[PDB]
C-alpha cells in the first residue's frame, strides 16, 4: 500500500475545501480525498485480478467502513460494466461496537461464498479477530479483507489485510467516515484533529 | 414538490444504449432511471435539505440495505455544500435495517431531542416507513424528516408523503442503485426493470 | 445506432426539479437532457469507440467551442478504459464559425481521426469539416456527435457515434451556446424565447 | 498563496500504487501529482476565483492545448458553486493558442472579468506578453495549475501547485504531443523520453 511516513506533515487546511463547521477543529489534512479515490481505483483492479472468477459477497463493516465500501464497490462496478472481466456482487452490512456484534444475526448468505470484508482501518487488529471468529461460524468458501488504512502500531498482533489503501503512522485520524465520538464522519478528507477539536467534541 | 414524475407509460431505455454489467445483460429488460439522472436529482435534493434543515445538526439515518447508495450520494452532495458555503449542516450518521424485523435498533435511544433525516430507497405500501416512524417517535426526537429516492404511485392504506422525493414512479418492480430482487441487482448503478429470465434465474 | 431518441412530444423536465444557475432561472423552458444522462450516454459511446478503434492510435479532434465538454468527458471515459489491459491518444482542436470560417492540421496526416462535435443540424458544418480534414490525408476518419437534430432541412449527416437524436428545437447547455451564453450550464435545455431576448 | 508546495526532493509515487494507462507502462517513472490531488486543489481554487471575480461577468480564457483539462475541471467546480448558492454571475468562454492564435475579438474582453487559465508557468515570459496585451478589461487574473521554481518573476493570481524545475507530463501536459491522455502528473522514464523523442 501507500506508505505514509512518521514525519509526514500533511497539508494546510487553507489549500483545500473543508466543511465550514470543522474549520477550527482540524489541524492538517492528512490524506486528501482525491488521493483516497485514486488509490481505491487501483485497489478495485487488484480486487478484480484476485477474486475475478467468482461471485462475491461484499461485507461492509459499519460505521466507518461505509465510505470506502461504497466507493470501492463503485470502482468495481465500473470494471464490471466496461471490461471483459467480471465479479457479480451481493452486499451485507455488519457492525462491531467487550465487542458486541450487530446484524449477524443474518449471515447464512456467507455460507459457501466468496467473502470480501471491507474495513476502514486496522489498528490493534482485535476488531478483525472478532469478525473472523464470527465469519468462521458460517463456513465461507473464501475470505479476503480490504482495509483503507493500516496503522503502524506496536500494539498490533501482526494481522495484515489482503488489500491495503495506506499504511499510516500511529496517530489518531478522522474523516472519510472515520469518527471521533461520532463527529467528523461527514468529512471527505482524512485529517488530524486540532486541540480545540478534541476539547469541543470530547465525550 | 412530489419529485420527478415518471409516467405510467414510460418505456425506459434500450439496454444497448447504456453501459451495464455483462453478468446482468440477459437479466434486465430496460434501463428505467439512468444513474446520472439519479445523481442530478439527488444534487437538487441536497440543496432542498440544506434549505429546510440548514444551520442545524442532523442525524442522518440510513435504512439498509437498499438505502445505502442514495444515502452515500445524498450525504456527499450535502458535504459539497458544507465545504463550499458558510451555511453548514453538521451531520452524524446511523444505520438501521428493516426486513417485520428491525436490526440495529438500539441507537434509537440516542435520537432523543435530535433532528433526524431518515433516508430510504423506496416507498411502496408505506408500511415499512410507518413502522419506522413510530419506532423513532417513541424516543422523542426534536424533529423527523424523511427522504425517499422513489415513491410508487400505488394505493396506500395511509396517505403518507415523505418530505423529500427523488422520483415518483409507476407501480412497477424496479432494481438497481442498491434496490434488489432477492439480493441480486444491488451491484448496478441504473434503476431498471427486470427481464422474465431475470425473475426466473434469481427466484428464491 | 441512431442513439437515444428523444421524441417530438417529449415534455422534458421542470427546471425546479434540478440545480440550475440562478442567472438562467427565467430564461429556460425545460431541461431536455440532464447532465447525468449525458454522462451515462457518453460512457457507452466511449466503449463503442474503444470497440471500433481500439488497439490503434487516435487523434481526437475537438470542434470548438461547443464540442469542448463532450470532448473532455468522452476522452475521460476512454482514458478510464485505457487503464485496463488501449487506445493511445493525441488531441487537437479546431473552430468553425459562420460563409463558414476556420480557426496546424498536419498532425492528422496518416492518422486515425475521431472528430468530436456537439451537434449536427443541417450538416453544413460537418461537410465543410470533412472536406478540409480529408485534405490533410488521414488514414481513417470517424465522427462522434453528442446530438443530431431531426430536421427536414437535411443533407444531413449520419455520424458514426451519436449520443442523442433530438427534435427540431434550439437547445443550449453542456457547452452549446446562445450568443456565447449558456455554455456554463451543465444540463442541455430548451432556451426560452423571452430568454433569447435577454442575451444579444 | 504559493499553492501546494511540492519540494525538490519529492520522490513521488511508485506506478504500481495507481491505475496508469497500459500503453504508458514503461514510459513513466513516478506518479508526481495524483489526479485526485489535482481535483481537490482545483475545487479550492474554484472557490478562490469566485471570491475574487464572482462579482461581475467572467470571461474564462483557455490556453490550448495543455490548459484544456485544468480549464474544464476548474469551470465545472465554478459552475457547481454558481448553481448551489442563490448568488451567481454568467460566465462565457474562449480558447487561444500561444505562438496569440484564434480567440474571439479581444474587444469581447472589455468591461469583463477576464480569467486566463494555463497549465504551467515556467519562466513566465509567455503570460507577461499575453497580459501586456489583453489589457481595458474590468479585471484580469491568471490561474495556473503548476508554477515552477530561472523565472522572470511573474506569479499568477491562483496557483495549483508549486513544483521543482523538473520536466512533467500528464493532465494534458505533453512531451511531443504524447502523455496528454494521462490523468496524473508524472515524470517520464528514459525509455519514454527516447521512444517519443522528437
Ligand atoms: N477514527 C479513528 N478510529 C480509530 C483509529 N485507530 C483505531 N480506531 C478505532 C477503531 N476500532 C478499533 C480498531 P482495532 O484494529 O484496534 O480493533 C474499530 C471500531 O470502530 C467502530 P466505527 O467504524 O467507528 O463504527 C483512528 O486512527 N481513527
Ligand atoms: N427492489 C425493490 N423492492 C421493492 C419494490 N417495492 C417494494 N419493495 C420491497 C421493499 N420493502 C417494502 C417497502 P413498503 O413501503 O411496501 O413497506 C422494504 C425492503 O427493504 C429491505 P432491503 O432494502 O432490500 O434490505 C421495488 O419496486 N423494488
Ligand atoms: N446551441 C445550438 N446551436 C445549434 C442548434 N442547432 C443548430 N445549431 C448551430 C450549430 N452550428 C452549425 C451546425 P450545422 O449542422 O447546421 O452546420 C455550428 C456551431 O457553431 C460553433 P460553436 O460551437 O458555437 O463555437 C441548437 O439546437 N443549439
Ligand atoms: N509539458 C511541459 N511543458 C513545459 C514544462 N516546463 C515548461 N514547459 C513549457 C511550456 N511552454 C511555456 C512555458 P514559459 O516558460 O514561457 O512560461 C508553452 C508550451 O505549450 C504549448 P501546448 O500547451 O503543449 O499546446 C513542463 O515541466 N512540462
Ligand atoms: Mg472499522
Ligand atoms: Mg469509532
Ligand atoms: Mg428500503
Ligand atoms: Mg429488498
Ligand atoms: Mg459544433
Ligand atoms: Mg453557437
Ligand atoms: Mg501552457
Terminal CA-to-CA distance of chain B, rounded, Å?
37
Closest CA to D71 of D82, D56, D60: D60
Q: What residues pair up with D143 in beta bridges, in sequence order?
A: D117, D158
Classified as helix, coil or strand, B94 is: strand
By the 8 A CB rule, do B102 and B135 touch? yes
CATH fold of C1-200, please?
A: Rossmann fold (3.40.50)
Dmax of chain B from CA atoms? 52
Beta strands C101-102 and C89-97 are antiparallel
Ligand 9 geometric centre to CA of D94 (Å): 14
C-alpha cell at A185: 464522519
CATH fold of D1-198, please?
A: Rossmann fold (3.40.50)
E strand spans, chain A: 2-3, 26-31, 56-62, 89-96, 101-102, 114-122, 142-151, 163-168, 173-174, 190-193
C-alpha cell at C96: 468553425
Dmax of chain C from CA atoms? 52
Give the whole-angstrom CA distance, residue A13 versus residue D158. 16
B173 lines ligand 2 (CB under 6 A): yes
**D90: enclosing H helix or E strand:** none
By the 8 A CB rule, do B98 and B128 touch? yes
CB count, 10 Å around CB of A8? Answer: 14
By the 8 A CB rule, do D124 and D152 touch? yes
Ligand 2 geometric centre to CA of B165 (Å): 16
Q: Which atom of ligand 2 is nearest to B63's Cα? A: 23
Q: How many CB pairs under 8 A join A and D?
A: 52
C152-157: Cβ within 8 A, 24+ apart? C153/C121, C153/C122, C154/C122, C154/C123, C155/C122, C155/C123, C155/C124, C155/C127, C156/C120, C156/C122, C156/C123, C157/C120, C157/C123, C157/C126, C157/C127
Give the whole-angstrom CA distance, residue D194 versus residue D198. 8
Give the whole-angstrom CA distance, residue B54 versus residue D144. 35
CB count, 10 Å around CB of B151? Answer: 22
Would the annotation count C117 as a binding residue? yes
Nearest CA in chain D to C185: D79
Partner-chain residue, chosen from C17, C39, C47, that has the shortest CB–CB distance to B1:
C17
Contact between B80 and D85 using a beta-carbon 8 Å cutoff: no
Closest CA to C24 of B51, B39, D86, B3: D86
Q: What residues pair up with A116 in beta bridges, in sequence order?
A: A58, A144
Q: Which atom of ligand 3 is nearest to C118's Cα? A: 23
C66 lines ligand 3 (CB under 6 A): yes
Asked if the C-beta of D26 comes within 8 angstroms of chain C's C-beta atoms, the answer is: no
Residue nearest to atom 16 of ligand 4 (CA): D126
Which residues form the pocket of ligand 4, taking CB atoms under 6 Å from any ligand atom? D 64-66, 119-126, 167-169, 173-174
Asked if the C-beta of C39 comes within 8 angstroms of chain A's C-beta atoms, the answer is: no
The question of whether D86 is a catalytic residue gets the answer no
Asked if the C-beta of D56 comes within 8 angstroms of chain B's C-beta atoms, the answer is: no
By the 8 A CB rule, do B190 and B33 touch? yes
Closest CA to C176 of C27, C100, C60, C70: C70
By the 8 A CB rule, do D171 and D161 touch? no
Among all chains, which residue has been given the C-alpha cell 414512479?
B169
**A133: enclosing H helix or E strand:** helix A126-136
Terminal CA-to-CA distance of chain A, rounded, Å?
33
By the 8 A CB rule, do C68 and C95 touch? no
Would the annotation count C170 as a binding residue? yes
CB count, 10 Å around CB of D194? Answer: 10
Q: What residues pair up with A119 in beta bridges, in sequence order?
A: A147
Give the whole-angstrom CA distance, residue A67 versus residue A63. 9
Residues of C that are catalytic: 121
Give the whole-angstrom CA distance, residue D198 versus residue D196. 6
B62 lines ligand 2 (CB under 6 A): no
Give the whole-angstrom CA distance, residue B168 versus residue B166. 7
Instruction: Give me the sign of the Cα torsion angle B108, B114, B120, B123.
Output: positive
**Domain range list for chain A:** 1-203
Q: Which atom of ligand 1 is nearest to A122's Cα? A: 15
Concatenating the DSSP letter of every residue in D39-66 gives HHHHHHHHHHHHHHHTTS-EEEEEEETT
- Cα–Cα separations (whole angstroms), residue D94 to A198, C31, C68, D63: 48, 25, 11, 9
Cis peptide before D65 (omega within 30 of 0): yes
Classified as helix, coil or strand, D22 is: helix
Q: Using the 8-state DSSP alphabet, how is residue C70 labeled?
A: H
Give the whole-angstrom CA distance, residue D61 versus residue D100. 12
Would the annotation count C169 as a binding residue? yes
For residue D43, report the phi and psi dihedrals to the nearest 5 degrees: -60, -45
B64 lines ligand 2 (CB under 6 A): yes
Decide: residue A5, CB within 10 A, 0-12 exposed, 13-18 middle, 19+ buried: exposed
Partner-chain residue, chosen from A19, A82, A89, that has the shortest CB–CB distance to B187:
A89
Going across the sheet that includes C171-172, the strands are C28-33, C188-191, C171-172
Concatenating the DSSP letter of every residue in C179-197 gives TTBSTT-SSEEEEPHHHHH
- Cα–Cα separations (whole angstroms), residue C123 to C40, C83, C156, C165: 25, 35, 5, 14
Give the whole-angstrom CA distance, residue C22 versus residue C17. 13
By the 8 A CB rule, do D33 and D161 touch? yes
Distance of CA A151 to the CA centre of its chain: 12
In CATH, the number for domain A1-203 is 3.40.50.2020
Give the whole-angstrom CA distance, residue A63 versus residue A127. 13
Give the whole-angstrom CA distance, residue C94 versus residue C105. 9
Give the whole-angstrom CA distance, residue C87 versus residue C76. 12
What's this structure's resolution in Å?
2.0
Contact between C44 and B18 using a beta-carbon 8 Å cutoff: yes
Give the whole-angstrom CA distance, residue D148 versus residue D164. 6
Going across the sheet that includes B102-103, the strands are B4-5, B164-169, B143-152, B115-123, B58-64, B91-98, B102-103
Would the annotation count C120 as a binding residue? yes
Q: Degrees (nearest 5) of the Cα angle A177, A183, A187? A: 45
B127 lines ligand 2 (CB under 6 A): yes
C-alpha cell at A25: 477543529
CATH architecture entry for B1-204: 3-Layer(aba) Sandwich (3.40)
Beta strands A56-62 and C28-33 are unpaired
Amino acid at each position: 500500500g501507500v506508505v505514509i511516513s512518521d514525519d509526514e506533515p500533511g497539508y494546510d487546511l487553507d489549500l483545500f475545501c473543508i466543511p465550514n463547521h470543522y474549520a477550527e477543529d482540524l489541524e492538517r489534512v492528512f490524506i486528501p480525498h482525491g488521493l483516497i479515490m485514486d488509490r481505491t481505483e487501483r485497489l478495485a483492479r487488484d480486487v478484480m485480478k484476485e477474486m475475478g472468477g467468482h461471485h462475491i459477497v461484499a461485507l461492509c463493516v459499519l460505521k466507518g467502513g461505509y465510505k470506502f465500501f461504497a466507493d470501492l464497490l463503485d470502482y468495481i462496478k465500473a470494471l464490471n460494466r466496461n471490461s471483459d472481466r467480471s465479479i457479480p456482487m451481493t452486499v451485507d452490512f455488519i457492525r462491531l461496537k467487550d465487542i458486541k456484534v450487530i446484524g449477524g444475526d443474518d449471515l447464512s448468505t456467507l455460507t459457501g461464498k466468496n467473502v470480501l470484508i471491507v474495513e476502514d482501518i486496522i489498528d490493534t487488529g482485535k476488531t478483525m479477530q472478532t469478525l473472523l471468529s464470527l465469519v468462521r461460524q458460517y463456513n465461507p468458501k473464501m475470505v479476503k479483507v480490504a482495509s483503507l488504512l493500516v496503522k503502524r502500531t506496536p500494539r498490533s498482533v501482526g494481522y495484515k489485510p489482503d488489500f491495503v489503501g495506506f499504511e499510516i503512522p500511529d496517530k489518531f485520524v478522522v474523516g472519510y467516515a472515520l469518527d471521533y465520538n461520532e463527529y467528523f464522519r461527514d468529512l471527505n478528507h482524512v485529517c488530524v484533529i486540532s486541540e480545540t477539536g478534541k476539547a469541543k467534541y470530547k465525550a
